[PDB]
Amino acid sequence: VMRLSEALYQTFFKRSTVYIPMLLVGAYFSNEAIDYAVDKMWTTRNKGKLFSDIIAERT
Amino acid sequence: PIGVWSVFQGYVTPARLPSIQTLTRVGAWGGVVVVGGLYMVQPWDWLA
Amino acid sequence: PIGVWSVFQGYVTPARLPSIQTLTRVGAWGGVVVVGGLYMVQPWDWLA
Amino acid sequence: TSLLKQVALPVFNSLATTYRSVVGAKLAKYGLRFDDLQDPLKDEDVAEALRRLPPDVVVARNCRLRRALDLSCKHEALPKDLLEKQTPELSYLQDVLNEVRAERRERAQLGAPAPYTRIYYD
Amino acid sequence: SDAVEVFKPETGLTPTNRLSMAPTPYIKYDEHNHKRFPPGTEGRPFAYFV
Amino acid sequence: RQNIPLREILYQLSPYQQDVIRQTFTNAPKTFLRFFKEKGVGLATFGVLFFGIKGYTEHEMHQERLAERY
Amino acid sequence: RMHNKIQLLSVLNTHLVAYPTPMNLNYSWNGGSLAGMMLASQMLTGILLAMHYVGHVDYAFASVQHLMTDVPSGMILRYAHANGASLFFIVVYLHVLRGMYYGSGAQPREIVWISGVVILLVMIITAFIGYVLPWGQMSFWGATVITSLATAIPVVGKHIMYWLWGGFSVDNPTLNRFYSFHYTLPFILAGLSVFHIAALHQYGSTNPLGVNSQSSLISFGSYFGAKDLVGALFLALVFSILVFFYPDLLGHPDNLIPANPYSTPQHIVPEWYFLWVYAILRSIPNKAMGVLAIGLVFASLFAMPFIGLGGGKFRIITEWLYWTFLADVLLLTWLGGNEITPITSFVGQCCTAYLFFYLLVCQPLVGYLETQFAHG
Amino acid sequence: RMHNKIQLLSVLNTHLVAYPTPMNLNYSWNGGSLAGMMLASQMLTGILLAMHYVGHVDYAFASVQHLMTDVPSGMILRYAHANGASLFFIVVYLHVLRGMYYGSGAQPREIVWISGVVILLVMIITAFIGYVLPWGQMSFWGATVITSLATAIPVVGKHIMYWLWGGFSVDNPTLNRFYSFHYTLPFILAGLSVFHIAALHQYGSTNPLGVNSQSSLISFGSYFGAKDLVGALFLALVFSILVFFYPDLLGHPDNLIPANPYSTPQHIVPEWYFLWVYAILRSIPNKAMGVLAIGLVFASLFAMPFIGLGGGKFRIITEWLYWTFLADVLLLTWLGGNEITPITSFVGQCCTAYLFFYLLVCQPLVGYLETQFAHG
Amino acid sequence: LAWASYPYQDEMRVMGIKACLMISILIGFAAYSKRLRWAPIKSQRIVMDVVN
Ligand SMILES: CCCCCCCCCCCCCCCCCC(=O)OC[C@H](COP(=O)(O)O)OC(=O)CCCCCCCCCCCCCCCCC
Ligand SMILES: CCCCCCCCCCCCCCCCCC(=O)OC[C@H](COP(=O)(O)O)OC(=O)CCCCCCCCCCCCCCCCC
Ligand code: HEC
Ligand code: HEC
Ligand code: HEC
Ligand code: HEC
Ligand SMILES: COC1=C(OC)C(=O)C(C/C=C(\C)CC/C=C(/C)CC/C=C(\C)CC/C=C(\C)CCC=C(C)C)=C(C)C1=O
Ligand SMILES: COC1=C(OC)C(=O)C(C/C=C(\C)CC/C=C(/C)CC/C=C(\C)CC/C=C(\C)CCC=C(C)C)=C(C)C1=O
Ligand SMILES: COC1=C(OC)C(=O)C(C/C=C(\C)CC/C=C(/C)CC/C=C(\C)CC/C=C(\C)CCC=C(C)C)=C(C)C1=O
Ligand SMILES: COC1=C(OC)C(=O)C(C/C=C(\C)CC/C=C(\C)CC/C=C(\C)CC/C=C(/C)CCC=C(C)C)=C(C)C1=O
């Protein structure tokens, strides 16, 4: 039913030497997004208890 | 008798050598190891 | 199976068991182990 | 022991029929028989009994085992119309295997071995 | 070569012999674990993207 | 490599001509119930024996502690 | 064709890529790959920890602490090693229980079962001498209690005890020789695992149906690589949870006290994976009889392929008795962690007697009755 | 047959008892079994040594002294482990020179030669980092001079150097990680040795005549067991002489001084088996060019099965040139123990140039001329 | 004192949250790639002459 596009296949999928650098940049951005989400959730939950909150409070 | 013996006997002609397309497809692996090393180390904006 | 299945299937008979002379000559290796241990440890007052 | 061992055999027969009923209910969903549960690698007498068989019996046994293994991979059972036709207790091997084991018991009383060994690979 | 001398089949109208002499184009696969796509579905598969 | 005599017709479909995980949601409750139907007796006898012997032992240990009191 | 030109390509292709395997193997057949992966993990993290550990009684605990706090990624490595030992024992115990359930040690796979029992004994010794290396209170006192079982042997007991200690008590030479033996024994485990796997490839694996499977075989590399990856990821999840969220859950708090030979703890207990052997030992009020009972347990494990009849699903009486055996070994695990008490002594004695009854009476005799029921 | 029923006995029989070997092998084919015996001896002595050695600064020297004077049979174990490295290198060097003389790496035994060169590199690294362990002046200063040679690779220099050291100088982290790496590397040596022997068994050994020997093959296990035992007894005589009569003959007296990072010795030279590489490095007046030449020697060693034409006798020009090569290598070994002098620099440069000339020009071109003379 | 026994508890928990999320996504992706490879076998059709 759902099917990968031919023009998108001929560019990023037909050769491994083009597929692998695309894989590495996607891996970089996926790690950045996961880091951002985990850090935002942790800092939101534990607000007011961290050391940086005390330091920014003393300014 | 694999190596210099193959070229002394005349077994390495213009034929049986890799083509330009074959060497380019093998030569395209040079960018993959460069990108992999830059991905592993990540020296961002280190180019001079 | 070969251990207890052979006893239960009736394959272990007196005619198939090793002889008493074979059991005597095989069991004579027990003195060899005793004298080998006595040679290794030498824990005796036997020399006098 | 002989006074109580005269009637210890019908109790054995009743337990055996109950056991075969339960296991044959388990076996029939895979299309298997009781004789298909014997492995030529596990027993050298079964390996000897299997080469004494006509080729069509061996072809049928292999077909049943292949169907059961495919069913086991698919986590399925046989459909109802096939499941009602299954005969888990129709023997094809017990006579030949009983003859093989009797021959081996006969050779052992005279000190002779069996004229076959285990299946050895490599 | 002939199939009677090379494959050496049994004689009869068994289920395997019927498909051997005339195979059917209406092949039914098992669909308990996977439902098939409509036949002749073209295009590079979506599983590469996944 | 171990010739096997067999007569069959085998059919196989391409893995890009069928779905991958969509039937897994339909069959999941049935497979759960089938698993517990097949392994119900063994898990129950395990649970009965383990928790009954553990409970009897812990009860008698508590009685032993109470018997040492003054 | 390319693997036909080099030997090392051919052996790898035959035994990893194109090896035939029964198509109906379920997820109970993943314990071996997981055990191999846990052995590789233990070897890697141990090699990395050995670059910061010092095997001396004045610096062992302090170097452990320094590795925990000051070495970059040292806490991850130390917790990964200490909890990977427990996950290694979990995976191996489940592998052995799979073999006990299906009767996988039977002919023609007696060598596989025997090399497995050898592997398990080496694993037990490796973990026991590795636990002494932090030189905490449990590390000292468990080595004292267990190596004092050699005096149960008459005449030459104390001499073997003093020879193993290097002195009159557990001290620095014991720790140094334990460190050398502990570094060494995992490589013997790797060799034994290679031999154990090459023994199985002679005939192949058994299947969950318990029948001959030579008609339905598929390639190992294309199909069971992904199926092993799935189980490896489920194991990596549990490993991550244990390392990062509950790192001292499977440990003991007394091993964080430095060792004191003049003040014993109130409750000397081993790690959880030695608790059933410890319960067998504590249930019998005689040291020689307890050591003999442990040796007879392992002798019964060696003698399983020759006295055991009875296998998987279609052999239903032994299949039902398997769950009673499993409840018995978990009751032995629980009883080891509890103190000595008349009811725990009685229950441990009954549980040991039932383990012997199942191993030596149920497996031959009930197996023979069900073979006569099914094929007589 | 009894060996036809257990797969372990079949492999052992096939590869150690009934293996067909040429009957005209002389005593220069005993290098490999002697090298394996020396590897096993080093592993045994070291595993025994590690039960009394402490891998920490301010304890390492004292632990070696306590091993020497207080451990029963400890002096024998230490001197055996120290001189066994020298005898191991003597045997492996004579093995390599045999292979150089006979052209043993040629088709179809290129994998055997390549795995040998890999084994030699691992042996060199193992011996160096094991020499660091006693923590004397020679240990510290040799480890300093060699590891601070990564500042020849541009840009990525001192980063790699400081990551190797675990700090800013050779100190306790360097010694502590060198202990773990040195314990671990000989098991890789044993595995590579097993692979190396298994690669030879695909095609069997060459003979002193250099002809096909398939017509005249005899069993290994009867005829070449006693022949190996004779050479092993000669090696045991030399080993016993070295251990008991001249235990410090092959060493350096400066390694009996505790290491001082602020005072350097007058002459810093390695062990004798590293001296030819040291002379090649020290002769060239550039660090990066010296490391490039050292790498080029081993690259030319790897390329030898694909460029080397010419074997033993009946190829007489290359046979004569082998003795010039042997003299060149022994001269480089002598030059490494001297001081830096303009004449010694000139002679070492000429010796390095001739070594490259023989390895890269004589072996292909003179060998091709010999083939054109003999069969042209 | 609870901080002194476990000085890196916060960093360990942040790394554990990231690891659990990543492994949980990878479990689904690996199950997908397992079921894709095994699909021609799980849906194969075998027809034989045996009825029993
Ligand atoms: C005094 C000290 C007080 C301590 C209080 C806390 C004790 C422990 C917590 C309470 C535990 C009791 C309920 C445990 C339920 C666990 C789940 C379970 O059993 O399901 C498994 C299992 C689940 O089967 P599946 O779902 O098929 O796996 O359930 C069963 O099959 C039922 C098990 C019933 C057998 C155990 C009954 C309790 C034993 C008590 C025996 C007392 C003897 C008294 C003799 C002396 C009298 C004077
Ligand atoms: C063939 C021989 C087989 C032998 C079988 C041995 C047992 C194998 C299974 C054992 C199950 C694990 C139990 C470990 C803890 C026992 C503690 C004990 O008894 O002493 C209580 C002990 C002391 O209690 P007290 O001395 O009585 O106060 O308490 C503790 O130390 C805390 C117990 C924590 C329990 C954690 C449970 C969950 C951990 C993770 C579970 C993972 C399951 C599998 C998942 C991965 C799959 C690959
Ligand atoms: C069960 C199998 C097991 C294997 C295999 C294993 N270890 Fe360990 N190791 C342990 C245990 C248990 C400990 C004790 C951990 C603790 O409680 O701190 C330990 C601890 C250590 C320690 C002390 C550091 C510390 O955290 O206490 C070192 C060093 C070590 N192991 C090295 C190794 C090396 C090197 C290898 C392999 C080449 C290895 N280990 C393989 C079980 C194992
Ligand atoms: C006491 C028993 C025992 C122990 C311990 C054991 N094995 Fe197994 N193992 C077996 C048996 C029996 C089989 C064959 C089971 C079958 O194929 O049905 C087996 C099979 C295997 C398999 C093939 C697939 C599988 O998982 O069944 C692998 C891989 C394996 N073992 C590896 C290991 C490793 C690695 C270790 C430990 C470091 C280990 N085994 C410990 C008995 C054991
Ligand atoms: C750089 C080369 C090289 C090194 C280093 C080397 N080998 Fe050899 N070895 C060879 C070659 C080439 C042969 C084949 C000789 C022939 O058959 O003519 C060989 C043959 C052998 C043999 C068969 C008997 C013999 O001596 O011919 C053994 C055993 C052996 N090697 C073991 C070892 C061991 C053990 C080591 C090191 C610990 C080692 N080798 C190191 C190249 C090497
Ligand atoms: C190829 C050579 C080689 C091998 C193989 C080798 N070693 Fe040694 N090792 C040395 C040398 C050289 C020294 C320095 C000895 C000296 O000068 O005192 C050394 C030193 C040591 C020391 C420090 C104590 C001392 O007296 O120097 C230990 C401990 C040690 N080795 C253990 C081992 C172990 C353990 C193994 C194998 C499992 C092993 N060695 C294998 C070469 C080797
Ligand atoms: C059908 O059945 C089968 C399986 O089940 C489904 C399998 O899974 C496998 C594959 C086996 C695996 C993954 C187990 C791992 C194997 C072993 C022998 C574990 C021991 C090996 C170790 C620890 C290697 C680590 C040591 C090294 C690398 C040496 C040191 C050197 C360096 C660090 C450089 C096979 C062949 C199989 O047929
Ligand atoms: C906290 O502590 C404790 C442990 O620890 C974690 C324990 O396990 C145990 C109990 C464990 C038992 C009964 C099972 C394991 C039993 C033994 C005997 C382990 C084997 C080890 C021995 C005999 C030590 C000797 C070492 C040798 C011989 C080195 C090996 C080298 C060669 C064979 C060459 C207890 C009580 C304990 O309180
Ligand atoms: C007096 O001075 C000198 C020494 O001193 C006593 C020497 O010895 C040597 C001899 C050393 C040479 C020729 C180089 C040795 C080779 C290498 C590659 C350097 C060693 C590399 C190290 C220690 C990097 C860290 C790696 C380790 C520990 C192991 C890596 C692990 C694996 C490969 C699995 C020379 C020349 C010397 O003049
Ligand atoms: C050209 O013809 C040939 C030769 O030339 C005549 C040879 O020489 C050899 C090879 C010789 C061999 C294999 C014997 C030499 C010994 C070696 C390599 C190992 C030394 C080991 C010893 C002395 C004992 C080790 C003891 C133990 C217990 C370690 C094992 C560990 C465990 C079991 C855990 C071969 C194959 C050959 O074709």
DSSP codes of every residue in E1-50: --HHHHT-PPPS--HHHHHHHS--S------SS-PBPPTT--SB-TTTT-
Q: Which ligand 7 atom lies nearest to the CA of residue G35?
A: 14
Residue closest to D102 by CA, chosen among C11, G349, G121, H280: C11
Q: How far is E3 from chain A (nearest CA, A)?
A: 41
Per-position b or e across D26-42, b if 16+ CB within 10 A of its CB: ebbbbbbbbbbbbbbbb
Beta-carbon contacts below 8 Å between D and E: 7
How would you class D49 by CB atoms within 10 Å of its CB: exposed for 0-12, middle for 13-18, buried for 19 or more? Answer: buried
CB-ligand 1 contact for F54 (6 Å cutoff): no
Selecting from G323, G334, G344 the residue whose C-beta is nearest the C-beta of F46 gives G323
H4 touches chain D (CB under 8 A): yes
Query: Secondary structure of D49-62 in the HEC alphabet?
Result: HHCCCCHHHHHHHH
Task: Please tell me the distance from the alpha carbon of residue H60 to that of residue H137, in angstroms, as a whole number.
Answer: 13
Could you tell me how many residues make up chain E? 50
Q: Which ligand 9 atom lies nearest to the CA of residue H188?
A: 34
Dihedral, CA atoms, D55, D56, D59, D63, nearest 10 degrees?
-170
Q: Is H95 annotated as a binding residue?
A: yes
Q: Are G38 and G231 in contact (CB under 8 A)?
A: no
Q: Are D89 and D26 in contact (CB under 8 A)?
A: no
Q: H50 phi and psi, to 5 degrees?
A: -70, -10
Could you tell me how many residues make up chain F? 70
Structure token digits, residue D59? 């072809």
CA of B2 to the centre of ligand 7 (A): 34
Q: Looking at residue H258, what DSSP letter applies?
A: B
Residue closest to G179 by CA, chosen among G60, G80, G77: G60
Task: Please tell me the distance from the alpha carbon of residue H282 to that of residue G273, in angstroms, as a whole number.
Answer: 57
Q: Are G270 and G142 in contact (CB under 8 A)?
A: yes
Angle (deg, nearest 10), helices H172-200 and H31-49? 150
Residue closest to G297 by CA, chosen among G313, G316, G284: G284
Q: Looking at residue G4, what DSSP letter applies?
A: G
Write down the number of H helices and E strands in chain D: 5, 0
Task: Please tell me the distance from the alpha carbon of residue G357 to that of residue B48, in angstroms, as a whole number.
Answer: 78
Structure token digits, residue B14? 């213009």
Residue type, G324: T
Task: Please tell me the distance from the alpha carbon of residue G315 to that of residue G102, in angstroms, as a whole number.
Answer: 10
CB-ligand 10 contact for H140 (6 Å cutoff): no
Structure token digits, residue H125? 């690294």
H360: CB partners within 8 A, 6+ apart: H300, H307
Residue closest to G55 by CA, chosen among H46, H52, H68, H132: H52
Interface test with A, best of B23, B32, B33, B44 (most A CBs within 10 A): B32
Q: Which ligand 8 atom lies nearest to the CA of residue G138?
A: 1
Task: Please tell me the distance from the alpha carbon of residue H316 to that of residue H370, in angstroms, as a whole number.
Answer: 8
Residue type, G366: V
Q: What angle do CA C28, C34, C35 make, to 5 degrees?
A: 95
H237: CB partners within 8 A, 6+ apart: none
How would you class I33 by CB atoms within 10 Å of its CB: exposed for 0-12, middle for 13-18, buried for 19 or more? Answer: middle
Residue closest to G232 by CA, chosen among G73, G87, G16, G22: G87
Which protein residue's CA is at the shortest distance from atom 29 of ligand 4?
A: G32
Structure token digits, residue H87? 């005898």
**Residues in binding site of G for heme b:** 81, 95, 182, 196
Q: Are A50 and A43 in contact (CB under 8 A)?
A: yes
Residue H76 C-beta-side C-alpha neighbours within 13 Å: 5
Angle (deg, nearest 10), helices H220-244 and H74-102? 130
C-beta pairs of G96-104 under 8 Å, 24+ apart in sequence: G96/G120, G97/G326, G98/G28, G98/G29, G98/G31, G100/G304, G100/G322, G100/G325, G101/G312, G101/G319, G101/G322, G102/G206, G102/G208, G102/G210, G102/G311, G102/G312, G103/G308, G103/G309, G103/G310, G103/G311, G103/G312, G103/G315, G103/G318, G104/G206
How would you class A45 by CB atoms within 10 Å of its CB: exposed for 0-12, middle for 13-18, buried for 19 or more? Answer: exposed
CB-ligand 6 contact for H42 (6 Å cutoff): yes
Residue type, H232: A
Residue type, G142: G
Q: Which experiment gave this structure? A: cryo-EM
Task: Please tell me the distance from the alpha carbon of residue G179 to that of residue H49, in angstroms, as a whole number.
Answer: 12
Residues of H with Cβ-Cβ distance to B8 under 8 angstroms: 368
* CA dihedral (H297, H303, H307, H312) positive or negative: positive
Task: Please tell me the distance from the alpha carbon of residue H131 to that of residue H181, in angstroms, as a whole number.
Answer: 12
Task: Please tell me the distance from the alpha carbon of residue A47 to that of residue A40, in angstroms, as a whole number.
Answer: 11
Q: What angle do CA D18, D24, D26 make, to 5 degrees?
A: 110
CB-ligand 10 contact for H333 (6 Å cutoff): no
Angle (deg, nearest 10), helices I9-37 and A16-45? 140
Task: Please tell me the distance from the alpha carbon of residue G351 to that of residue G279, in angstroms, as a whole number.
Answer: 10
Task: Please tell me the distance from the alpha carbon of residue G328 to that of residue H321, in angstroms, as a whole number.
Answer: 77
Beta-carbon contacts below 8 Å between C and G: 18
C-beta pairs of G56-65 under 8 Å, 24+ apart in sequence: G56/G172, G56/G175, G56/G176, G56/H54, G56/H56, G56/H59, G57/G135, G57/G171, G57/G172, G57/G175, G57/G259, G59/H56, G59/H59, G60/G133, G60/G134, G60/G135, G60/G175, G61/G134, G61/G135, G61/G136, G61/G258, G61/G259, G64/G134
Q: Are B46 and H155 in contact (CB under 8 A)?
A: no
Secondary structure of residue G20 in the 3-state scheme: strand
CB contact under 8 A, I52 and D74: no
Q: Which residue has the tokens 């990551």?
A: H163
Task: Please tell me the distance from the alpha carbon of residue D48 to that of residue D113, in angstroms, as a whole number.
Answer: 14
CB-ligand 9 contact for H120 (6 Å cutoff): no
Interface test with E, best of F8, F10, F11, F31 (most E CBs within 10 A): F11
Interface test with C, best of G104, G107, G159, G304 (most C CBs within 10 A): G107
CA of H27 to the centre of ligand 7 (A): 39
Instruction: Indicate the resolution in Å.
Output: 2.4
Secondary structure of residue H219 in the 3-state scheme: strand
Compute how many other C-beta atoms are within 10 angstroms of the C-beta atom of residue A59: 4
Structure token digits, residue H68? 């020497």
Q: Is H81 annotated as a binding residue?
A: yes
Q: Are G282 and G340 in contact (CB under 8 A)?
A: yes
Nearest CA in chain G to I28: G230
**Residues in binding site of G for a ubiquinone:** 201
CB-ligand 10 contact for H197 (6 Å cutoff): yes
Q: Looking at residue D66, what DSSP letter applies?
A: H
G36 touches chain D (CB under 8 A): no
For residue H136, the cross-strand partners are: H258
Q: Are F37 and G312 in contact (CB under 8 A)?
A: no
Q: Looking at residue I45, what DSSP letter applies?
A: E
Q: What angle do CA G239, G240, G242 make, to 5 degrees?
A: 65
Task: Please tell me the distance from the alpha carbon of residue G122 to that of residue G117, in angstroms, as a whole number.
Answer: 9
Task: Please tell me the distance from the alpha carbon of residue H321 to that of residue H173, in angstroms, as a whole number.
Answer: 47
Residue type, G73: S
Cis peptide, bond prior to residue H108, ω within 30 of zero: yes
Dihedral, CA atoms, A17, A19, A20, A21, nearest 10 degrees?
90
Q: Are G109 and G305 in contact (CB under 8 A)?
A: yes
G47: CB partners within 8 A, 6+ apart: H180, H184
Q: How far is A31 from chain B (nearest CA, A)?
A: 12
Residue closest to H183 by CA, chosen among H76, H46, H39: H46
Catalytic residue positions of G, numbered: 201, 205, 227-228, 271
F14 touches chain I (CB under 8 A): yes
Cis peptide, bond prior to residue G342, ω within 30 of zero: no
Q: Are H80 and H40 in contact (CB under 8 A)?
A: no
Task: Please tell me the distance from the alpha carbon of residue H196 to that of residue H203, in angstroms, as a whole number.
Answer: 12
* CA dihedral (H171, H175, H177, H182) positive or negative: positive
Q: Are H128 and H333 in contact (CB under 8 A)?
A: no
Q: Looking at residue G30, what DSSP letter applies?
A: G
CB-ligand 7 contact for G33 (6 Å cutoff): yes
Residue closest to D58 by CA, chosen among F3, A51, H370: F3
Structure token digits, residue D29? 């969903």
Structure token digits, residue I40? 């021609």
Q: Is H201 annotated as a binding residue?
A: yes
A18: CB partners within 8 A, 6+ apart: A11, A12
Task: Please tell me the distance from the alpha carbon of residue G86 to that of residue G270, in angstroms, as a whole number.
Answer: 12
D52 touches chain C (CB under 8 A): no
CA of H343 to the centre of ligand 9 (A): 28
CB-ligand 4 contact for G119 (6 Å cutoff): yes
Q: Are I41 and G223 in contact (CB under 8 A)?
A: yes
CB contact under 8 A, B3 and H306: yes
Ligand nearest to the CA of G85: 3
A53 touches chain I (CB under 8 A): no
Q: H94 phi and psi, to 5 degrees?
A: -65, -35
Q: I47 phi and psi, to 5 degrees?
A: -120, 130
Structure token digits, residue G147? 């190596």
D7: CB partners within 8 A, 6+ apart: none
Secondary structure of residue C3 in the 3-state scheme: coil
For residue G256, the cross-strand partners are: none
Q: How far is F47 from chain D (nearest CA, A)?
A: 24
Mark whether A and B touch (3+ CB pairs within 8 Å).
Answer: yes
Secondary structure of residue G258 in the 3-state scheme: strand
Q: Which ligand 7 atom lies nearest to the CA of residue G197?
A: 18
Per-position b or e across E35-46, b if 16+ CB within 10 A of its CB: ebbeeeeeebbe
Residue closest to H192 by CA, chosen among H6, H342, H46, H36: H36
Residues of E with Cβ-Cβ distance to A13 under 8 angstroms: 44, 48
How would you class H72 by CB atoms within 10 Å of its CB: exposed for 0-12, middle for 13-18, buried for 19 or more? Answer: exposed
Q: Which pairing describes strands I45-47 and H217-219: parallel, antiparallel, or unpaired? A: unpaired
CA of H32 to the centre of ligand 5 (A): 5
Residue closest to H204 by CA, chosen among H195, H194, H214: H214
G164: CB partners within 8 A, 6+ apart: G147, G150, G174
Task: Please tell me the distance from the alpha carbon of residue F61 to that of residue F69, in angstroms, as a whole number.
Answer: 13
